[PDB]
Amino acid sequence: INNSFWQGKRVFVTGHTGFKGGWLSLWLQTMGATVKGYSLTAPTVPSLFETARVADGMQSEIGDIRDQNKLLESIREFQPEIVFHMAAQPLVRLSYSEPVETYSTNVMGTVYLLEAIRHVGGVKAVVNITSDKCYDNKEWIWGYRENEAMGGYDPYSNSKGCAELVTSSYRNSFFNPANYGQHGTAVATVRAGNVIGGGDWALDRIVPDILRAFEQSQPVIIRNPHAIRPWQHVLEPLSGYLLLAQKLYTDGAEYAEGWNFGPNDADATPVKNIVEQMVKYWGEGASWQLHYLKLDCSKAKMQLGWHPRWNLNTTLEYIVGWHKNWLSGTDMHEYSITEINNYMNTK
Amino acid sequence: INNSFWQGKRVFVTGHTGFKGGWLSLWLQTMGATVKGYSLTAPTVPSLFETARVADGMQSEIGDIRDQNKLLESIREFQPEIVFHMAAQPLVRLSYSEPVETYSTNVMGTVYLLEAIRHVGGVKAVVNITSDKCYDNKEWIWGYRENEAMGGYDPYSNSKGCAELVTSSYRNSFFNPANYGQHGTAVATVRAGNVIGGGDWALDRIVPDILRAFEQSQPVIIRNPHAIRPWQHVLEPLSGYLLLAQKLYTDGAEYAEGWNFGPNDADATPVKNIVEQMVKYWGEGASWQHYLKLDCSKAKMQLGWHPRWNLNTTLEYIVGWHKNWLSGTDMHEYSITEINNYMNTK
Amino acid sequence: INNSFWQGKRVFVTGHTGFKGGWLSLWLQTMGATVKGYSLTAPTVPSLFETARVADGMQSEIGDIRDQNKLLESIREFQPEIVFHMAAQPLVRLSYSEPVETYSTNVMGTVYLLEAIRHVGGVKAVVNITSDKCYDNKEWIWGYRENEAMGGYDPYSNSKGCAELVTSSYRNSFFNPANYGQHGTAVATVRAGNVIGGGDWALDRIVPDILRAFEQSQPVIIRNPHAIRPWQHVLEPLSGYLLLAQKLYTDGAEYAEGWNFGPNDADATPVKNIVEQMVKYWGEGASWQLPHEAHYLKLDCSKAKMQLGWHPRWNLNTTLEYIVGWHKNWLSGTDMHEYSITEINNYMNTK
Amino acid sequence: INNSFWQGKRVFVTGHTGFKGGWLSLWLQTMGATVKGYSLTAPTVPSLFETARVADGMQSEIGDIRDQNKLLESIREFQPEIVFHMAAQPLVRLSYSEPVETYSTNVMGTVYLLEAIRHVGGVKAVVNITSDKCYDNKEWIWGYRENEAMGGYDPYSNSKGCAELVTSSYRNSFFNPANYGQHGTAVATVRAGNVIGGGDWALDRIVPDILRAFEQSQPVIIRNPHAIRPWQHVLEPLSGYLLLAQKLYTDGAEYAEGWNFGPNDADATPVKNIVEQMVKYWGEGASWQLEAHYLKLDCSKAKMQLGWHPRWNLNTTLEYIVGWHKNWLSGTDMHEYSITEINNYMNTK
Numbered sequence A: 001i002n003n004s005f006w007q008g009k010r011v012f013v014t015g016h017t018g019f020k021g022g023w024l025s026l027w028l029q030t031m032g033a034t035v036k037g038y039s040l041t042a043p044t045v046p047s048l049f050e051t052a053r054v055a056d057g058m059q060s061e062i063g064d065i066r067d068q069n070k071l072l073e074s075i076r077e078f079q080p081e082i083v084f085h086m087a088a089q090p091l092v093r094l095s096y097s098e099p100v101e102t103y104s105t106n107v108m109g110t111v112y113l114l115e116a117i118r119h120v121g122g123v124k125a126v127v128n129i130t131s132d133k134c135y136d137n138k139e140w141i142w143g144y145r146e147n148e149a150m151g152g153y154d155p156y157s158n159s160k161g162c163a164e165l166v167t168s169s170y171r172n173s174f175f176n177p178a179n180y181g182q183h184g185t186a187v188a189t190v191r192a193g194n195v196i197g198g199g200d201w202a203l204d205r206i207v208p209d210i211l212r213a214f215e216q217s218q219p220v221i222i223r224n225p226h227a228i229r230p231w232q233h234v235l236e237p238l239s240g241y242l243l244l245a246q247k248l249y250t251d252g253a254e255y256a257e258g259w260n261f262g263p264n265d266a267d268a269t270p271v272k273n274i275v276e277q278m279v280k281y282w283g284e285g286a287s288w289q290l291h292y293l294k295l296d297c298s299k300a301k302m303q304l305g306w307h308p309r310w311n312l313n314t315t316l317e318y319i320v321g322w323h324k325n326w327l328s329g330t331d332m333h334e335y336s337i338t339e340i341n342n343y344m345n346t347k
Numbered sequence B: 001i002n003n004s005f006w007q008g009k010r011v012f013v014t015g016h017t018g019f020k021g022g023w024l025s026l027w028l029q030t031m032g033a034t035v036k037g038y039s040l041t042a043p044t045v046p047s048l049f050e051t052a053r054v055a056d057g058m059q060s061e062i063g064d065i066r067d068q069n070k071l072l073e074s075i076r077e078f079q080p081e082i083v084f085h086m087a088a089q090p091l092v093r094l095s096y097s098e099p100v101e102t103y104s105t106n107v108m109g110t111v112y113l114l115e116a117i118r119h120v121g122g123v124k125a126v127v128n129i130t131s132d133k134c135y136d137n138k139e140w141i142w143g144y145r146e147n148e149a150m151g152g153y154d155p156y157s158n159s160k161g162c163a164e165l166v167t168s169s170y171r172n173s174f175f176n177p178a179n180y181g182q183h184g185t186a187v188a189t190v191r192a193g194n195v196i197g198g199g200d201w202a203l204d205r206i207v208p209d210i211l212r213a214f215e216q217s218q219p220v221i222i223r224n225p226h227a228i229r230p231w232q233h234v235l236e237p238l239s240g241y242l243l244l245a246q247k248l249y250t251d252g253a254e255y256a257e258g259w260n261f262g263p264n265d266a267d268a269t270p271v272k273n274i275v276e277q278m279v280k281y282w283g284e285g286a287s288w289q290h291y292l293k294l295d296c297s298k299a300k301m302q303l304g305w306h307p308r309w310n311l312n313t314t315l316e317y318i319v320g321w322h323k324n325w326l327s328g329t330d331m332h333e334y335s336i337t338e339i340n341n342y343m344n345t346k
Numbered sequence C: 001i002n003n004s005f006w007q008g009k010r011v012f013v014t015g016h017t018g019f020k021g022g023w024l025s026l027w028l029q030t031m032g033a034t035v036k037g038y039s040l041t042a043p044t045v046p047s048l049f050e051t052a053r054v055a056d057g058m059q060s061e062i063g064d065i066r067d068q069n070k071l072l073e074s075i076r077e078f079q080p081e082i083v084f085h086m087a088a089q090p091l092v093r094l095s096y097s098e099p100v101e102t103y104s105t106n107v108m109g110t111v112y113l114l115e116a117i118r119h120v121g122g123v124k125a126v127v128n129i130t131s132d133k134c135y136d137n138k139e140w141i142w143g144y145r146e147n148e149a150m151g152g153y154d155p156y157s158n159s160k161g162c163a164e165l166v167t168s169s170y171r172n173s174f175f176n177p178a179n180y181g182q183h184g185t186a187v188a189t190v191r192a193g194n195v196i197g198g199g200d201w202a203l204d205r206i207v208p209d210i211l212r213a214f215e216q217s218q219p220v221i222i223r224n225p226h227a228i229r230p231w232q233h234v235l236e237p238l239s240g241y242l243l244l245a246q247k248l249y250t251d252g253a254e255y256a257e258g259w260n261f262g263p264n265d266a267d268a269t270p271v272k273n274i275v276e277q278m279v280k281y282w283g284e285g286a287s288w289q290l291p292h293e294a295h296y297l298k299l300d301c302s303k304a305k306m307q308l309g310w311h312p313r314w315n316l317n318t319t320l321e322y323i324v325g326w327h328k329n330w331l332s333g334t335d336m337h338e339y340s341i342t343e344i345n346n347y348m349n350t351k
Numbered sequence D: 001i002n003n004s005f006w007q008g009k010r011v012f013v014t015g016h017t018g019f020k021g022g023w024l025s026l027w028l029q030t031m032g033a034t035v036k037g038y039s040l041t042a043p044t045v046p047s048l049f050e051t052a053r054v055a056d057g058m059q060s061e062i063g064d065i066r067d068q069n070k071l072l073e074s075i076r077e078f079q080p081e082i083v084f085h086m087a088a089q090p091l092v093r094l095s096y097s098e099p100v101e102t103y104s105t106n107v108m109g110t111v112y113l114l115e116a117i118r119h120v121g122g123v124k125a126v127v128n129i130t131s132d133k134c135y136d137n138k139e140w141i142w143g144y145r146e147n148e149a150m151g152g153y154d155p156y157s158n159s160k161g162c163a164e165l166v167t168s169s170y171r172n173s174f175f176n177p178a179n180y181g182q183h184g185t186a187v188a189t190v191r192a193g194n195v196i197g198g199g200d201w202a203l204d205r206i207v208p209d210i211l212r213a214f215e216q217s218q219p220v221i222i223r224n225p226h227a228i229r230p231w232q233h234v235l236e237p238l239s240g241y242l243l244l245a246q247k248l249y250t251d252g253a254e255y256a257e258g259w260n261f262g263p264n265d266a267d268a269t270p271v272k273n274i275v276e277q278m279v280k281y282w283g284e285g286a287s288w289q290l291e292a293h294y295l296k297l298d299c300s301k302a303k304m305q306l307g308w309h310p311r312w313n314l315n316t317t318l319e320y321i322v323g324w325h326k327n328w329l330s331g332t333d334m335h336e337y338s339i340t341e342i343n344n345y346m347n348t349k
């Protein structure tokens, strides 16, 4: 991550009012980038957006990505050189009760974003965040490789598989490598999941639910204790997104493809483990009661020189620290900035 | 194809004002089905819709499939037991010019249709027409199998790949074969391409262009003489769609998957040959100056489906249909007889 | 198939005393090629080898392909420009009772043949006959494509999958396309199955057994009347082998890969129908008396069609008519050497 | 790995005179197994076989696995319950000049072994060592999964792909999990590569050559400083082989398939760093002079179904390599030293 590269860059971020978007926006701000965000009002209360004062250091616009023209104008007005598309209906459970809204937001929203970029021009790098769930689920023990089939069982997962197809076609049709000397836009998709960190209040997700139980000194009710997942601190995939954006900007079409970001497998553990480790780090008032989808990230490692930095223990520790600070009244804007620095200064 | 099965069935057809939709609607009408169509105004002039008087024997509604509520009510008002979704922005060329409209129409339109079916209830069989182009193109000599990856280069092809994904998720989430005893809806997708026949006036389409030249007693100049495409008369895939619909209705979820329909590879012919045959079929006033394919073993083995007309026969009927159109023949009755001739084959 | 091309070509054929090998040898002879065969004594009595006088118009050597040096010498002595490797333990049933012999014959036999070719030099085209059974069986309704995985359940099928691997490695290591300008050898494998025709006296094979029944005016007993197999007249895949050989010779490494040869699936006919058609072609003295399979092994032959311009010539009915004809002429005492030559001519002249 | 399980077990090991075979034989001996080996004379001088006195505590037979009858009689005489097939022509380079012998040894040798087992009867577990190179090489960045295509460019790699096919057919035809209740034989294949450790004197091998230079106090000349290979101490895959053998014996056909064993990719290190660490570990007298992918395996199956996992990172492994070699040079009893190394491994985590 080259701080000097980000200084002064005009970066447009959809979904800046969310969990991942907030951390990314804060990170970009600390590196001196000129950032503009486009999202609906923060999805939860509390929210990282408000607690870490994400809006104060950037141009923040509230809008629906399904509003094709409003989005077009937002990008035209800003003239970004780099775009991170993170806005989406991210909940599986909810996708079952609101499938239409999930497809319109995740598929058409992506179409409208790419169309805006196509017409506005000048965008050098586009990083479209889809999901680790975009892959046709084979229900096997192996991590998915980027060249495998897109799909998805539930509307959310499937809409992300569709978003991947959309990005592929837009790239081939309007941002083709052979014509890169003309349009100059390098478009890529990034696939990652099981993101955890301080500031995520999407309760239905395990970690946020755990932290809420702990704060109330009430036992957290674990659904599937034996469920194994590849947990990773939110800054891990984000570091990959930033690294990729840099390569897309400076090197070009060579990196305009799909990319997996995830933790080392030897790190993955069952939810039972996560909770137990967290209980220890938290201390008093912490208790509980009662194959797997993963990605092969050899491509990011071999072609981007990417690698995670924090093991699960370090990650869970930072989580407890962040949440306890928030509860204690600490300035979470500065605290979050320091967390980014700690990550950045970890080698 | 049980002529008796279709009698009285309430069939809803999106895209009934188009080429394939018109032939399907006419076919359903001749078999005694109660048909309702939902489409935008016929895409061309002339059109099979008007020339073959498709609307006469059915309920015809003009509406946009992107209008979620209008579609919902149209289906609720009709209470169909069988649905054929054929409405879509079908042009590759146009998709490069209007990518957004292509995705909204082909992807969201399919989403709105399935959502309507989900809420209205009572639908027993759903046949969603996607495209032979829904497959991620490996650009090889082999015909694609139904279990291979979805994708698509251009917005049109890609939107069809997306439509396949959408249908798969809706089926798994809301019309799961495991819960068939509850919802009773068998949902499938059908993949076919290179459809030709009398009554198609889409521009830039090879066959229609050849006829456009003939009717103008002007020589047609071909640009790709060696190009091979698995051409098939429009009634060939439609017969497969009807056969599948019957199976979905009577047998159920066992057939709720994706299905390829296409001609036998041995029937594969280059355009130069196609032009020659057509010139010979037309007569005076006619002159001139790997490839994507599908493996249809599944339709054959599980549906007992199989093509009926070789390319020659198809080209002959194409010329017959068109020359008759120019001659002032009643194309509604002529088209009905064509369907009967097809049904009689074998 | 260019008859002119074969005139004077030195062709070495292993398995010339067998069913497919005999028809191929006879075909090569009629086109003026100088042929030498290397096989064990004909596998059955009667045999096409003896009934059609296969040896009379060629050099016929009896030897085991598992005898590395004897095979090397037989080849070095002959200096062939074209080689067709058809010798193998071809029975699945037997492979269960003699797995070791199956592997030694099909795998090491192929290794010894390729090694001999490597050292003798001068060979321009090598066509190694493996089997339609070389593919890892996915138990599905689709025809296999040449780029799919090799394997095999039983020792025979598996040994053929191994023969494919062996040929691939020998080509990559010693007959690499990148070095064609030096060695000049174009090596390929051909995959085909369900071959039928006059002159096959293998045991427990439906067509031959049907003829044996007709032969003794005994009703032919049928077990699974619904059984389907992509049957093809022996000359169909052989025409493909010859076409490929010519291309390997004249064009080179461009064709040094694996190739599928089979009939059109539209030709797929169950056994009951087959028996019925043969009963009709046979006439007086023919009759017949009585688990289902969801799928049957088949091949996708788009590659041969597109890249070689290959195409089958006879539907099953036509083929069955020729089968019955060949048999009764044999039974009547007809000169089967000349009869078989005419059959080859009829095939070449078809269309 | 259950020491009590191995006590008294009759284990037959082909290739016991080699590098991997010697360590495995020593390991089996320390756990109380009754071991018999069948190999050609040790391939090198020096050899682990002689230096670590591998033959002392076992029945050692010298024979060619291409001698179908001799191998048959060797197995019949011993009546093993567990068999580890490690004998093979393991060199890629040699396979180019001797392809026939490579195929005869690796393919027919495997056929003869399985045929012997088929007829002798009583064998409960068979672990056939093939190679990480049995996979059709796509030349990509991803680790191969057990369900992917067999193949191989060179005769050695290809012969291992063939050995996999042979084992699959023999299992399906004669040791089918469907009638395990009859034959009682659970047959599996194990795929692993880039094995390093004390006692390997194979020629033209990076680690052994580094030690050859160090032992002569001469700089080692490095020609491929950036080359990366999933190096692993010899005891790592062997622990997997032993664990699998136990499961095949006790649980049965459920484990009669192919299995990958390798190090974690996060452990991937280029030869330059390897030479550096080794120079540091050796000390006085050690010195050196100066593609976008590499063949690797996905070992999720071994992890998930066998509960297997690597125990030593590369650094720990290199330290033990240097230690083993320096002790050998110092006149240390390498039989006891090697036994202790096995114990150290068993004690890890």
Ligand SMILES: NC(=O)c1ccc[n+]([C@@H]2O[C@H](COP(=O)([O-])OP(=O)(O)OC[C@H]3O[C@@H](n4cnc5c(N)ncnc54)[C@H](O)[C@@H]3O)[C@@H](O)[C@H]2O)c1
Pocket (backbone or CB within 6 Å): A014, A015, A016, A017, A018, A019, A020, A021, A038, A039, A040, A041, A042, A043, A063, A064, A065, A066, A085, A086, A087, A088, A089, A090, A105, A109, A129, A130, A131, A132, A133, A192, A193, A194, A195, A196, A202
């Ligand atoms: N957190 C994870 O574990 C995980 C796993 C896979 C994928 N993702 C993806 O990462 C992105 C960020 O997810 P997150 O965890 O921060 O979720 P989040 O809910 O905290 O953030 C989602 C953002 O999307 C915006 N948004 C949603 N619908 C919108 C619409 N119609 N118009 C405009 N903005 C809209 C929201 O306002 C919000 O800022 C999403 O694309 C999500 O699918 C997250």
Ligand SMILES: NC(=O)c1ccc[n+]([C@@H]2O[C@H](COP(=O)([O-])OP(=O)(O)OC[C@H]3O[C@@H](n4cnc5c(N)ncnc54)[C@H](O)[C@@H]3O)[C@@H](O)[C@H]2O)c1
Pocket (backbone or CB within 6 Å): B014, B015, B016, B017, B018, B019, B020, B021, B038, B039, B040, B041, B042, B043, B063, B064, B065, B066, B085, B086, B087, B088, B089, B090, B105, B109, B129, B130, B131, B132, B133, B192, B193, B194, B195, B196, B202
């Ligand atoms: N004809 C072919 O060769 C071929 C090949 C592949 C796929 N298809 C598919 O078959 C179907 C029929 O194609 P066709 O050749 O008859 O084309 P067509 O253009 O003649 O018919 C298209 C129909 O779609 C309807 N439609 C389009 N957009 C609509 C919208 N927004 N709202 C409502 N109705 C709308 C039109 O009114 C028309 O009736 C399409 O789904 C097409 O993608 C056809």
Ligand SMILES: NC(=O)c1ccc[n+]([C@@H]2O[C@H](COP(=O)([O-])OP(=O)(O)OC[C@H]3O[C@@H](n4cnc5c(N)ncnc54)[C@H](O)[C@@H]3O)[C@@H](O)[C@H]2O)c1
Pocket (backbone or CB within 6 Å): C014, C015, C016, C017, C018, C019, C020, C021, C038, C039, C040, C041, C042, C043, C063, C064, C065, C066, C085, C086, C087, C088, C089, C090, C105, C109, C129, C130, C131, C132, C133, C192, C193, C194, C195, C196
């Ligand atoms: N006929 C089919 O339907 C079919 C299907 C797949 C593959 N094949 C393959 O085609 C080839 C020809 O089969 P076929 O039907 O003519 O069978 P066949 O039994 O009539 O001919 C086999 C030939 O192999 C020779 N042979 C066998 N073992 C030998 C050995 N050790 N040394 C030397 N020669 C030996 C025999 O002498 C004989 O000439 C074989 O490779 C067979 O596996 C045939």
Ligand SMILES: NC(=O)c1ccc[n+]([C@@H]2O[C@H](COP(=O)([O-])OP(=O)(O)OC[C@H]3O[C@@H](n4cnc5c(N)ncnc54)[C@H](O)[C@@H]3O)[C@@H](O)[C@H]2O)c1
Pocket (backbone or CB within 6 Å): D014, D015, D016, D017, D018, D019, D020, D021, D038, D039, D040, D041, D042, D043, D063, D064, D065, D066, D085, D086, D087, D088, D089, D090, D105, D109, D129, D130, D131, D132, D133, D192, D193, D194, D195, D196
């Ligand atoms: N060491 C590695 O990195 C690696 C990588 C892949 C595969 N392997 C496989 O692991 C096994 C052990 O290899 P290794 O490193 O110990 O090699 P090695 O050369 O040290 O041992 C090979 C053993 O094979 C025996 N052998 C060879 N040919 C024989 C024959 N014809 N008859 C009887 N015995 C014969 C030798 O006598 C020796 O004991 C082999 O199967 C090899 O292919 C090793």
